[PDB]
Write a protein that binds this ligand. Structure first.
Ligand SMILES: *[C@@H]1O[C@H](CO)[C@@H](O)[C@H](O)[C@H]1NC(C)=O
Lengths: 85, 450, 204, 85, 51, 51
C-alpha cells in the first residue's frame, strides 16, 4: 500500500523497543540488531539508513544495561533526520 | 495477679505454640503471670473464628493472641473493633486503618520495591496467590505504572493442585516466550516450594534467571535445592542469628527436648514463631507498664454475650490497647515499636542473597533509609568456524590420513594458527553446516552462515 | 443480623455483602445450612448455600476487548467488588500481548479528591493512552466521568469501556455529545415485553 | 539540524491549512500555491515532492469551495508517500 | 449570530446546530457578548460538545 | 582571517568531520592540536604527545 514516513517512525521506535525488551540486561549490545529487525518490519525508504536513523544513533550512544526504559523514553522523540541518504 | 489472655492456634501449628510456651517461661515474672487459654481451630473458617472469639470473650480475657486468613481477617478486625478487645497476630499486616489490632509482622512492601530498584529491574514477572491479600500486588502495580515498569501478574493460587502439572510448564513456557528471566515469588512457603520443584523439573533454575522470594522466612525454608542450580536467588530475613540475643535464645532453643516442645529442636526457627515469642514479650511488658503507671484494668464482672445487641464494650480495653501500642522492646525481630494504628515501625529487614557456599546478608532495609548495603564482596578450546574457499581453506591431498586442524590448509588456516598463537588458546577448525558466509533470511529473519 | 434472623427461625435469607463481609456470609450460610440469595457480586470459588443472582461479567468484558482489538489500554478499578476481574484481565493480558496499566481509584478519598484525578489522567497523558476501561460502581463511574469531561478528554479519539451491568443506569447524557466512543453492558433489555410492562407499571 | 519527516508533515499540513484559510471560497483554486508556501516554510527532502505530497493530492482532489475545514480535517492524516521521490 | 432570541424552554439542539454551523467554517476564535446567564448557558453547551 | 570557528578550516578531514558529526547528532568545534604532533610515546617519561 501507501508509504508514510511518520507512520514509519512511530512503528520504528516501537519495534526497536519491543525487540530490545527480550534482550534485557544485554540491551546495550543488541541495539543495532533490533534496529535491523525494526527496519525490516516497518520498512525503510533507503535500506542503508533504516526506518529512523537518529533514534538509532541516540539509543546506541545513550542505552546502558537495564537503563532501557528511560533511554527509549528519552530517544523516541528524537529527529530521524533525512531518510534519503 | 492472674492475667487471663485467650489464644488461637491453627491446627498443625506446633513450633509457634512451642515458642509461645518458651516465651511464657522466659518472660514470666513474680509480679504477674499470664494465664493463657489455648483454642485450636480452622483459621480459614470464619464461623470457627467467630465462635472461638466469642468463647474467649465470654471467658473474660484481657487480650487475645492469634492468627487470621484472608477470609477470616475481617471477622477479627470487626469484632475486636466493636468489643474493644486487643488482638495480637504474627499473621500478615492489614492494609488500612484497623483499631484494636496489634500486627507483629513488619510491612514487606518497602523492602521489596527497594530491592527491585536496587537490582534495576525494568521488566519482570510477579507470581502471587490470594492468601495474605493482594495489597502487595496493588502496590507493585501502582509503582510499576509510576516508574514505567512492564510487569506480568500471574495468579498461581487459583490453579488446582490435582490438575496442576502441565499448567506450570505452560506458565514458564509463556514466560520463556518473551525471554523474560527475572521472576518474583510472593507466595506461602508451601506454594513456594512447589513452584521451585516445578522450576528445577523444567530446568528453569539454570544460569540467567533471578528469583526474588518475598517473605520474612527466606532462610526458614530449604534453599539447598536451587543452591547449586546456578540461578541467583534473593530474599528477606527478619531474624539475625548473628545477634547475641538471638544466639543465646537459639542455644536454649536447641537444647530443648522435642517431646515436650514439638519441633523445637532445631538450628533455626520459623519467623512466625519468633514473632510469637516477641509478641509474648510485648504483652508482658505492656501489662508491666500498666502496673507501673498504677492503672487497674481488672474486670468487675463477666463480659456476657458478645452477640448481645446492642453490643457494649468495656472501658478498660482502650487502656489495654494504648498500653500495648506504647510498648518498645528488643526482640528476635529487632527493634519492636508500634504506631497509633498498630503497625510495626522502625524495623530492620535484612536483605540476603543465596550464593554457592550458602546464604549471606548483602544489606538491610529500613523504613526511612530504604536499602543500605553491607560489606562489598580453565581455558576452553576455541571453536573456529570457516568455509572452504581457495586458497583460504582447502583439503589436503592426503587429508584422509589426518585428523582435526591438520586436515585443512590455506591462507586463513595459517592466519588462524597465528591469531591463536599470539592470543594463546587452543583452536578447533570446523566447517560451517549450511555452507554460507552470512545472511538474513527475508522470511524466517534468521541469520545463516558463520 | 444473620444470627438474629437465624434465631427467629427463617427458612431463607435475601441480602447483600461487601469484600469484607462476604466470607462471614458464606461461612455461616454454609455451616448453618441456611440459603442466601444476593444481587451482590459473585464469590470466586465454590460456595454452597449461596445463590448469586448477578451474572459473571469477565467473559463478556474480555470478549469485548478482543472485539475492539485493544493491544494497550488503561484499567481503572476500586477495591469494592474485589480484584477478581483485575486478576482475570491481567492473566489474559499475560496470555495475550496486551499492555495493561492498572490504577487503583478506590483508595482515593472523595473529600480531598480534585488534583488526584488531574494527576491520574496526567500519568495517563504520559503514555498517550486513549483507550480506558473503567471497572467501578456507578458512583465512582459518574465521578470519574465528570472529571473526564472537565479536562476535556471526552472529545473524539478517546474510547471508554464501562464494566458493569448498569451501563444505562448511570447518566450518559454528559458524555453523549462529546464525540468519544463509549461501550458497556446491559443486563436488562427494555425492549422485551416483560420489561416494558414492568416499566409501565413502575413509572406509575 | 535534522528535519524529522513527521514534524515536517505536521508543519506541512498546518501551513497549508492556515494558508488556505486566508482565501475564502477560492480554496480549491489556491491549493497548490499554499502547498508551495508550506513546502517553503517547512522545508523539504526533495524540492519537487514537497513536505507532504499525499496530503497535497488529497486536498486538490477533495477540496471544494467553502468546504475547506472538513476537507483539510479529512486529509491531514493521510500518508505522505515517498519523501525522496 | 444572535443568541438572545432563542427561548430557554426549547433550547437544546439550537446550540448544537449553532456550533455545527460554526464548525462548518472551522471557526475557533469566538467572542461572547452576553448577559452572565446566557454566558453560562453557552459555556456549558461548549463543554458538552467538547469545543 | 575574516571568518571564525569551523568556517576557518576547509579540507577532506573537515568535510568528513562535518559528515560524522551530522550523522552522530552532535555540535562540533574544530581545534588545532597544541604540540603540533600526531601522536607518540616518549620512551623515558612514558607520556603521550600529540592528538
Ligand atoms: C522510625 O520511622 C519514622 C517514620 O515512620 C521516622 O520518623 C523515625 O525517625 C524513625 N525512627 C528511627 C529511630 O529511625
Amino acid at each position: 500500500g501507501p508509504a508514510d514516513c511518520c507512520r514509519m517512525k512511530e512503528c520504528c521506535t516501537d519495534r526497536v523497543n519491543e525487540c530490545l525488551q527480550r534482550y534485557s540486561g544485554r540491551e546495550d549490545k543488541f541495539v543495532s540488531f533490533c534496529y535491523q529487525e525494526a527496519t525490516v518490519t516497518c520498512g525503510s525508504f533507503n535500506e542503508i539508513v533504516g526506518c529512523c536513523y537518529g533514534y538509532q544513533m541516540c539509543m546506541i550512544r545513550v542505552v546502558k544495561p537495564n537503563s532501557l526504559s528511560g533511554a527509549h523514553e528519552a530517544c523516541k522523540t528524537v529527529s530521524c533526520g533525512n531518510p534519503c541518504a | 495477679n492472674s492475667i487471663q489472655i485467650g489464644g488461637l492456634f491453627p491446627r498443625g501449628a506446633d513450633q509457634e505454640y512451642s515458642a509461645f510456651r518458651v516465651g511464657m517461661v522466659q518472660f514470666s515474672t513474680s509480679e504477674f503471670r499470664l494465664t493463657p487459654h489455648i483454642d485450636n481451630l480452622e483459621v480459614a473458617n470464619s464461623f470457627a473464628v467467630t465462635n472461638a472469639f466469642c468463647s474467649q470473650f465470654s471467658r473474660g480475657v484481657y487480650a487475645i493472641f492469634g492468627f487470621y486468613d484472608k477470609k477470616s481477617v475481617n471477622t477479627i478486625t470487626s469484632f475486636c473493633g466493636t468489643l474493644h478487645v486487643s488482638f495480637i497476630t504474627p499473621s500478615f499486616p492489614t492494609d488500612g486503618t484497623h483499631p484494636f489490632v496489634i500486627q507483629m509482622r513488619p510491612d514487606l512492601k518497602g523492602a521489596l520495591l527497594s530491592l527491585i530498584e536496587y537490582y534495576q529491574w525494568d521488566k519482570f514477572a510477579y507470581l502471587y496467590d490470594s492468601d495474605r491479600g493482594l495489597s502487595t500486588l496493588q502496590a507493585v502495580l501502582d509503582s510499576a505504572a509510576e516508574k514505567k515498569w512492564q510487569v506480568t501478574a500471574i495468579n498461581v493460587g487459583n490453579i488446582n493442585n490435582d490438575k496442576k502439572d502441565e499448567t506450570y510448564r505452560s506458565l514458564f513456557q509463556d514466560l520463556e516466550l518473551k525471554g523474560e528471566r527475572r521472576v518474583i515469588l510472593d507466595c506461602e512457603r508451601d506454594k513456594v516450594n512447589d513452584i521451585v520443584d516445578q522450576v528445577i523439573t523444567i530446568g528453569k533454575h539454570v544460569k540467567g534467571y533471578h528469583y526474588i522470594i518475598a517473605n520474612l522466612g527466606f532462610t526458614d525454608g530449604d534453599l539447598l535445592k536451587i543452591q547449586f542450580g546456578g540461578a541467583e536467588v534473593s530474599g528477606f530475613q527478619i531474624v539475625d542469628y548473628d545477634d547475641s540475643l538471638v544466639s543465646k535464645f537459639i542455644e536454649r532453643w536447641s537444647t530443648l527436648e522435642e517431646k515436650e516442645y514439638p519441633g523445637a529442636h532445631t538450628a533455626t526457627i520459623k519467623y512466625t514463631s519468633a514473632l510469637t515469642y516477641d509478641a509474648v514479650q510485648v504483652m508482658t511488658e505492656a501489662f508491666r507498664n500498666l502496673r507501673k503507671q498504677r492503672i487497674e484494668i481488672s474486670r468487675r464482672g463477666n463480659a456476657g454475650d458478645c452477640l448481645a445487641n446492642p453490643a457494649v464494650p468495656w472501658g478498660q480495653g482502650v487502656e489495654i490497647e494504648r498500653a500495648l501500642k506504647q510498648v518498645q522492646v528488643e526482640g528476635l525481630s529487632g527493634n519492636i515499636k508500634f504506631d497509633q494504628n498498630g503497625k510495626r515501625i522502625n524495623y530492620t529487614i535484612n536483605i540476603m542473597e543465596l550464593k554457592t557456599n550458602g546464604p549471606r546478608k548483602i544489606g538491610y532495609w529500613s523504613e526511612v533509609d530504604k536499602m543500605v548495603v553491607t560489606l562489598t564482596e580453565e581455558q576452553k578450546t576455541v571453536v573456529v568456524t570457516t568455509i572452504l574457499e581457495s586458497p583460504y581453506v582447502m583439503m589436503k591431498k592426503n587429508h584422509e590420513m589426518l585428523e582435526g586442524n591438520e586436515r585443512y590448509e590455506g591462507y586463513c588456516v595459517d592466519l588462524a594458527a597465528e591469531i591463536a598463537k599470539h592470543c594463546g588458546f587452543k583452536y578447533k577448525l570446523t566447517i560451517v553446516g549450511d555452507g554460507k558466509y552470512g545472511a538474513r533470511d527475508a522470511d524466517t529473519k534468521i541469520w545463516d552462515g558463520m
